[PDB]
Amino acid sequence: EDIGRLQLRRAWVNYENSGTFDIYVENQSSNWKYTMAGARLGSNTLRAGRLNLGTGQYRFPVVGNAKFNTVYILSDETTPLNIIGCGWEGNYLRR
Amino acid sequence: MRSYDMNVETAAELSAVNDILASIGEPPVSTLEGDANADAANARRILNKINRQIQSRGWTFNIEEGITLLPDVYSNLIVYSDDYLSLMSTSGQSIYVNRGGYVYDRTSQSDRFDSGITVNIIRLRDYDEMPECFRYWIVTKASRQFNNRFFGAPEVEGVLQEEEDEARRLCMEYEMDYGGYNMLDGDAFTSGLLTR
Amino acid sequence: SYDMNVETAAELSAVNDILASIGEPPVSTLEGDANADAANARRILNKINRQIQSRGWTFNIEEGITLLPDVYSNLIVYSDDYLSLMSTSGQSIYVNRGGYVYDRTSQSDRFDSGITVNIIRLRDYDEMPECFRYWIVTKASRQFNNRFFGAPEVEGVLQEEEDEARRLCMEYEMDYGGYNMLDGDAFTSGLLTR
Amino acid sequence: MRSYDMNVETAAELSAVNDILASIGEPPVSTLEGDANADAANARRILNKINRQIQSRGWTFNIEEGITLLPDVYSNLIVYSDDYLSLMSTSGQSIYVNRGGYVYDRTSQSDRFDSGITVNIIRLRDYDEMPECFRYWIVTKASRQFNNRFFGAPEVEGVLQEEEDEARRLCMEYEMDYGGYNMLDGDAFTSGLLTR
Amino acid sequence: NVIKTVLTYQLDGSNRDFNIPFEYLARKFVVVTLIGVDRKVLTINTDYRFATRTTISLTKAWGPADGYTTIELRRVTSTTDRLVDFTDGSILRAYDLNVAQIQTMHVAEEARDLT
Amino acid sequence: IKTVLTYQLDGSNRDFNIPFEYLARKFVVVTLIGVDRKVLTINTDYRFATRTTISLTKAWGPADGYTTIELRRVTSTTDRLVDFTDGSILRAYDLNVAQIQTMHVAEEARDLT
Amino acid sequence: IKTVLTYQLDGSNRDFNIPFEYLARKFVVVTLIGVDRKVLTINTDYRFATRTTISLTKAWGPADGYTTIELRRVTSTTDRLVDFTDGSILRAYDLNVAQIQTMHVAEEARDLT
Amino acid sequence: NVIKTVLTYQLDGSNRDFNIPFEYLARKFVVVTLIGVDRKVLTINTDYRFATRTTISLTKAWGPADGYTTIELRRVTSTTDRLVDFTDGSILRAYDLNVAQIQTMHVAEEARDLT
């Protein structure tokens, strides 16, 4: 649907048995990283000495024109990354 | 009028553009100069237009009382530039109008002036050089138009309408505090009556 | 051991309330890697804090403080810190022109011996009364979802909450001010003296 | 502000979290410490925020009349900690404000005090160490926000708004009962008039 | 310049309650002494009780009697003893990590303030 | 390597580099010396063209005796750059700057002795 | 036990025991006092007989005017025994030594005052 | 017929502020001189300032004193120096293009007015 302007509010990436990764969001002007490292403080699977990688959904704020901002994921930190989904939310008034 | 990119960037204008952009939902822009963002350029164009309009309405700090406009002695005619938002006489009836970009005396049918004139002028200022209370009204009006023109969302449109109405109320509240107008002694007519 | 009195950073906790206003998980820090919500929430929080302070409150307005020009230039600086300049009595004359204090009536931006004005000066998110600190957060929380991610039910409640928060900050100001129509005011006080 | 887990669990606080959790529909949690429940932690955050907010409004048991704040004799300046929700002078006009975390006399332009000051302070308390009538109002308000923020259900939201209005009504009813204010003899002005 | 950790209150007669502004990682870290004759450190059990996270209460009213003119209350943070210890089984809390830096930052306050 | 150091003005020099590494612009504190200990608003009086180099912006410090400038890093312990909150993802960034802050705070206290 | 302590030189006394705990050998610095401060290499100038005691190989002695031997632990703030990366486990041993390393730097500051 | 770039204002006593109608590419292009004895070109640093894009403020009160009857305000555009330069890495924008023609058009303005 080329007609209209879509203002996308956010996005999410589904990962399974995966470690760290950085989800770069680059609009025309600025850029953002949103690193996902660990389980999150206060979570059963965060406990020390444990391998720390697991299945979950990561939701990151991506805001812009839906046509000028590029979202690309990359990671180096020696840990498997299996992406089993992706999505986004937007407003999309047609004009 | 003047180009949007002509104006020098300041911290006040940078936040104003960020606020206008957020109305649609665009992320804030770090710097205004040297960017390819089309939305950021528009927000400055909308901001400058609303800045000029809100200044055009007569405000106490905006209106200059009895300032003297000096003509070129060789030319004998005063320049009525676009920077002059309003030109009115200090007395009741204003006699100065614009003909060909120069101040024209309609009652005298002559645009050649000697020794200068005393008038009330509203002169345009930047987005800076403006009262803080007025800065949020300019932004609130501008974001309303910016949302309307480019990404018209009814949900945010209704919220901005009451935000502007409150913004106007505060600005009037600022004007009354700034003016300090007295209906007994500050009044021109009533002051002469109170003499005893 | 729960005996501690350790307190968290107020600026991040205020931002977390803006993030948590929609249910987003809190962010552990502000400075560091760029984050959209952390950058948006922090900017709106500072914007609203400036907005609320500009309105003028009894603690906010500083009465009769003098501004001194530079000795050589004879110009006073109208800094971005100054949220308002007004004359002590009435019919405020000093205005901004070129970033310097300008006397519109006297048509001269050059002053000597200083001037006396009522200035509202910017303060941090801290150094504000608790009534106002809540109002800024709940105003920024409402502003946050209107612009970026719109939740209809969250907006409905936050509008009611903001009105309630605004009402409380007014009651703080009347309690703080303690204004008296009989003796406190300038006019009637002279009349009552007998 | 303090972290949610900083506070000691009490059977009073445990019940409040269960009430807040039940608003969405989550089952009650038996023990607050040693849990991985994210929702239980959030209920602590909402409870503490609402606790501080409702305490901030002036209540006769909350307000302490004419308590003395003592400065450090070496430093000569008083500390205006975040625990102090409100600082007001006992007389009509309040002259103490916060600058840099220290009490500041705006009328005197000095933050250095000697011999201490007498002021009215609202001081923060735990969720416990609160009137029981206020505990349900704190829960009911926190229940509304907790439902709103995480799982916003219109059906339960409407009921809680009615429940909160009744909760406020009872708390005011407690306030008048606790206060026992008399317009004839408890009144400052009218008491002097009744002398015969 | 201001000394946050160490601060003294003039007794000015019978003042039961005194405010402790500084943060403290343990109830044992705050130490209260009277000043005017000798540095007499007070016992936590009987001599003084807190009754509140932020203010203390002293049983007897020293005032100007016994030659004690002022009260001195300060925080001393035990270097050897660590409030938080990490074990493999235990879950990482925001509590546990925060106390790690906060304690060793409090010790740095004490060294800087005594200078 | 020392957080405490002093630069003599050595004529009207706008620029002075700071050797010590610092976390935030607020943490670095700079005072003009020569007649009396004068503290200056860093965000206003100086410009950071680079992180290390401060700018007097106008040959500040003239024959009035302000011929000495003091460079210090005072990292505030009360205001933590990172304080971990439950429900937030841990980050190697957050753990590193949390350690680097208290090391900066401890290092400043050690040099003050 | 003080992290900083100076021992009487006592003529030709080769060995000196230190009570303070130290994470690494490189942290401990031994200097010569009496005429000027002299820094000594870890391995050539002295040797660690055990963890607790240190023996000076060259027996500098009272000769040249040095009258006392000063032994202090300095923990480098820039050099960290454990550093945190986004991947990997967060072992409890690493988090503990990270705690005690920055604790040691603060402990050195308090003893100096 | 009208001379837009060059215009003179009678001092008529002490008047601080004078309005410049012509548009100028740079503040260095606007030149201010007093008339009545000699053409004394004013320095921008101290003798006269602006405080506004269209207004200039003069420090001392010339008026009829010192024999300077009027003030002369004209704009001279430097031919040799170009305000805008184009490079391959540079992005074309409205600012750079508009300056290119209009600076040249200002130079032709002065030549026509001086005739």
Let me know: does A34 contact C35? Beta carbons within 8 Å.
Answer: yes
Question: G39 forms bridges with which residues in the sheet?
Answer: G31
Q: What angle do CA D119, D121, D126 make, to 5 degrees?
A: 160
Contacts of A92 (CB under 8 A, 6+ apart): A1, A4, A5, A6, A7
Cβ <8 Å between F87 and D4: no
G52 by Cβ neighbours in 10 Å (0-12 / 13-18 / 19+) ranks as: exposed
Q: Which of H14, H53, H58, H71 to mutate to test the interface with B (most CBs of B within 10 A)?
A: H53
Nearest CB to A48 within list G85, G86, G90 = G90
Residue H19 DSSP SS3:
strand
Let me know: does E19 contact E51? Beta carbons within 8 Å.
Answer: no
Q: Tell me the residues of chain C between 30 and 49 that have a Cβ less than 8 Å away from chain F.
A: 31-33
In this complex, is the C-beta atom of A44 within 8 Å of any C-beta atom belonging to chain D?
A: yes
Closest C-alpha to D138, from D168, D104, D94, D175: D168
Cβ-based neighbour number of residue D192 at 10 Å: 8
- Sign of the torsion formed by the C-alpha atoms of C21, C22, C26 and C27: negative
Closest C-alpha to C117, from C135, C142, C92, C81: C92
Distance CA E84, CA E97 (A): 8
Report resolution in angstroms.
3.5
> Which residue stretches of G19-91 are H helix?
none
Q: How far is CA E93 from the centre of its chain?
A: 26
Closest-CA residue of A relative to C38 is A61
Max intra-chain CA distance, chain G = 55
Cβ <8 Å between B81 and H21: yes
Q: Partners for A (CB, 8 Å, 3+ pairs)? A: B, C, D, E, F, G
- Provide, as residue numbers in chain A, all residues whose Cβ is less than 8 Å from the Cβ of D36: 42-44
Question: B122 forms bridges with which residues in the sheet?
Answer: B63, B86
Distance CA D114, CA D76 (A): 6
Distance CA G88, CA F95 (A): 13
Closest C-alpha to G56, from G7, G13, G4, G5: G13
Six token digits for residue C82: 């100054």
In this complex, is the C-beta atom of B25 within 8 Å of any C-beta atom belonging to chain A?
A: yes
- Provide, as residue numbers in chain C, all residues whose Cβ is less than 8 Å from the Cβ of A25: 36
Residue G4 DSSP SS3:
strand
Cβ-based neighbour number of residue A41 at 10 Å: 26
Terminal-residue alpha carbon distance, chain B: 52
In this complex, is the C-beta atom of C82 within 8 Å of any C-beta atom belonging to chain H?
A: no
In this complex, is the C-beta atom of C104 within 8 Å of any C-beta atom belonging to chain H?
A: no
Distance CA C126, CA E36 (A): 37
Distance CA E18, CA E11 (A): 10
Six token digits for residue B30: 């770090």
